[PDB]
RNA sequence: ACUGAAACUGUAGUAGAACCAAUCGGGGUCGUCAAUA
């Protein structure tokens, strides 16, 4: 039982995004930027619509990026100047151009959840495929979400982490956890 | 790769109960005084 991870090195984001594109369809998208950190979600091909401005490092822009769906996770981190090492995620064995494959044994795999900010908004934002969450600590939340959110839904976000040996004495750990889905509750 | 936000150590509770500032006492009545030569 393998976890698959592939590496590729001194590549900006929106060129990380592209290059896995073909597994990062539908993905949620986690943006890190100095003043945002906001959520976004691919095409079913996997572009994002303003991708290049939207991915862009250079005025206080994207220096860490998290994308998500069932099958892998794209992580992506600003080494200098808005290059850095992109890390895809996947239980699949996969090809992809210039990304360094790696693997990981791992023993087991269990579900975990976390909860969401918020209860779902009295309405959802006007952009199709979007709910909003709100909490009177943080305010809105929208989240790329397709389901209309009943009154009294909770939305988690479901991840599987990985256990495996650490040590030759056999000591297991979790080694890593992979984001998947946002899922309603 | 960037300080969380916002939140009254307050709310109720009598320094009080008990203990006599009191007990006894006719506003009365008679023998001297002094020490030397």
Redesign the pocket.
């Known amino acids: 039982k393998n976890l698959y991870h592939y590496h590729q090195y001194e590549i900006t984001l929106e060129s990380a995004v592209d290059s896995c594109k073909n597994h990062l369809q539908a993905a949620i998208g986690l943006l890190?930027?100095?003043?945002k950190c906001e959520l976004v979600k691919l095409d079913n091909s996997g572009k994002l619509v303003d991708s290049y401005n939207r991915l862009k490092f250079n005025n206080?822009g994207v220096?860490?990026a998290r994308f998500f769906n069932l099958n892998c996770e794209l992580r992506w981190?600003?080494?200098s100047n808005g290059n850095?090492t992109a890390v895809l995620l996947s239980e699949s064995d996969i090809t992809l151009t210039g990304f360094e494959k790696g693997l990981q044994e791992f023993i087991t795999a269990i579900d975990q959840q976390y909860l969401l900010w918020g209860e779902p908004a009295k309405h959802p934002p006007n952009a199709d495929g979007w709910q909003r969450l709100a909490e009177?600590?943080?305010?809105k939340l929208d989240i790329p979400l397709d389901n209309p959110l009943k009154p009294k839904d909770r939305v988690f976000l479901t991840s599987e982490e990985y256990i495996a040996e650490v040590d030759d004495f056999g000591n297991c750990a979790v080694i890593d956890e992979r984001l998947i889905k946002l899922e309603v509750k």
């Open positions: 890190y930027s100095p003043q206080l220096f860490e981190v600003n080494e850095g009177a600590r943080i305010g």
